[PDB]
Amino acid sequence: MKPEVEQELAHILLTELLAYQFASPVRWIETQDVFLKDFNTERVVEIGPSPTLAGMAQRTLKNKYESYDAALSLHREILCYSKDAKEIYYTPDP
Amino acid sequence: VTTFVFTGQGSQEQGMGMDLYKTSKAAQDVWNRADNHFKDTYGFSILDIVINNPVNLTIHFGGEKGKRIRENYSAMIFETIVDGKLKTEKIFKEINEHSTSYTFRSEKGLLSATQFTQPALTLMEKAAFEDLKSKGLIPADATFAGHSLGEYAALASLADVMSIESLVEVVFYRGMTMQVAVPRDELGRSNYGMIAINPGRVAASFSQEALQYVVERVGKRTGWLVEIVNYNVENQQYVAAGDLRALDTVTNVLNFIKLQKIDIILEEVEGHLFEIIDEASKKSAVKPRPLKLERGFACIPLVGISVPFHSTYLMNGVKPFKSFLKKNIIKENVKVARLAGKYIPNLTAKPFQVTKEYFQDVYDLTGSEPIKEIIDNWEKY
């Protein structure tokens, strides 16, 4: 694939994804299974005014992956931009 | 290893992002660029709406600038292609060549209508990411995703598929599209909302087995529209959308199945709650059309949502939306290297890949003809 046909296909795939997104169910359960399990994400940073997504990632991390995180010694960090600014920006309180 | 998740519509409060707007040069460039575009194109300031949250906002079409702004409103259209035969396009607003003003009206603040909350939320998330990026805090290979509206903000932040002016313009449009998508009849009150359902807070339930059954059987022999639209937390959070009549029915039925303890781990078990649906519909079909949702045993209403997003109701116009996106997302700005393996769409909870299998899975979920022909002639070499 030349990197112009691939760009065209990516454009006309993104278009359909965004066009059908608002008329299709949001599969957030399988989405956070992707980045918590397949990627083994250590820092989850939520961008937004409230910790909506961060709270529901923490709930997912207790309902599942509790034994998974302990066995693999994963230290997950769930940071919301609105409240965990010091940890996101690396400005610890002395 | 970092993942960035962008939140969608929800509690959008007065003054959000304004603390960062005062201290961050990167955030200022995001807001000022969008505020200038809104003021020049539509004669209002999104910054003013965020800071002050006015109940009403009047746009005046006085002079040459006013007449240019009025023609921008007049060109705004609503297309619902494949509505039966073909297009049945209409016009967003009652603004004509003799109009001198237009008033946006709300109950307790215009930072609650989807045409203003969606650009405001997209801006505050873009400004925060731009300020994080200006401090060198964004890892190169970070994965990202967004919840409903957050998906569009995530793409503009990590992939830069649109400019700020195009992003806010195509969010304000499609914000007004949904504002007129539901038949708000008398007091701007269409009977539509969302409720968050905790299926474990009522009894033993499941993702698509027990809670989904009380929703699919209440929509297949009653003729109404109730759908599960968000799968947020397994066994603990599911969002239903549809008629504000059916949301009250669902919350009452779940309250009664909590009070009357049942264990489930035709008409015997399959149709028992079908009879329950029949008896609950009679008390429900006579309900007055307007109502206010109340917190229940398992159901908590979603404040700030009035459109049945992610349901089959908004399915007639998906191709006019598809055509609108093609004219505003330029192919030259896609930058597949910023998307492949890092972007997880809501429609497909799988990392973005330009592959035949990825196209096939999208087709197996939407039935899009362009995707089908792409698959059919995938030998694009």
UniProtKB/Swiss-Prot annotation, chain A:
- The chain residues annotated with the modification Phosphoserine are 50
Record note on modification: 4'-phosphopantetheine is transferred from CoA to a specific serine of the Acyl carrier domain by the C-terminal PPT domain. This modification is essential for activity because fatty acids are bound in thioester linkage to the sulfhydryl of the prosthetic group.
Crosslinked positions (Glycyl lysine isopeptide (Lys-Gly) (interchain with G-Cter in ubiquitin)): 37
Q: What else is known?
A: Present with 17000 molecules/cell in log phase SD medium.
Q: What does this protein do?
A: Fatty acid synthetase catalyzes the formation of long-chain fatty acids from acetyl-CoA, malonyl-CoA and NADPH. The alpha subunit contains domains for: acyl carrier protein, 3-oxoacyl-[acyl-carrier-protein] reductase, and 3-oxoacyl-[acyl-carrier-protein] synthase. This subunit coordinates the binding of the six beta subunits to the enzyme complex.
Family per record: Belongs to the thiolase-like superfamily. Fungal fatty acid synthetase subunit alpha family.
Quaternary organization: [Alpha(6)beta(6)] hexamers of two multifunctional subunits (alpha and beta).
This chain belongs to the protein called: Fatty acid synthase subunit alpha
State the gene name recorded for this protein. Answer: FAS2
What part of the full protein is here?
Answer: 1 to 94 of 1887
UniProtKB/Swiss-Prot annotation, chain B:
**Region named Malonyl/palmitoyl transferase:** 1-185
Active site (UniProt): 148 (for malonyltransferase activity)
Further comment: Present with 91800 molecules/cell in log phase SD medium.
> What biological function has been recorded for the protein in this entry?
Fatty acid synthetase catalyzes the formation of long-chain fatty acids from acetyl-CoA, malonyl-CoA and NADPH. The beta subunit contains domains for: [acyl-carrier-protein] acetyltransferase and malonyltransferase, S-acyl fatty acid synthase thioesterase, enoyl-[acyl-carrier-protein] reductase, and 3-hydroxypalmitoyl-[acyl-carrier-protein] dehydratase.
As for family, the record states:
Belongs to the fungal fatty acid synthetase subunit beta family.
Subunit record text: [Alpha(6)beta(6)] hexamers of two multifunctional subunits (alpha and beta).
What protein name is recorded for this chain?
Fatty acid synthase subunit beta
Q: Which residues of the full protein are shown?
A: 1661 to 2048 of 2051
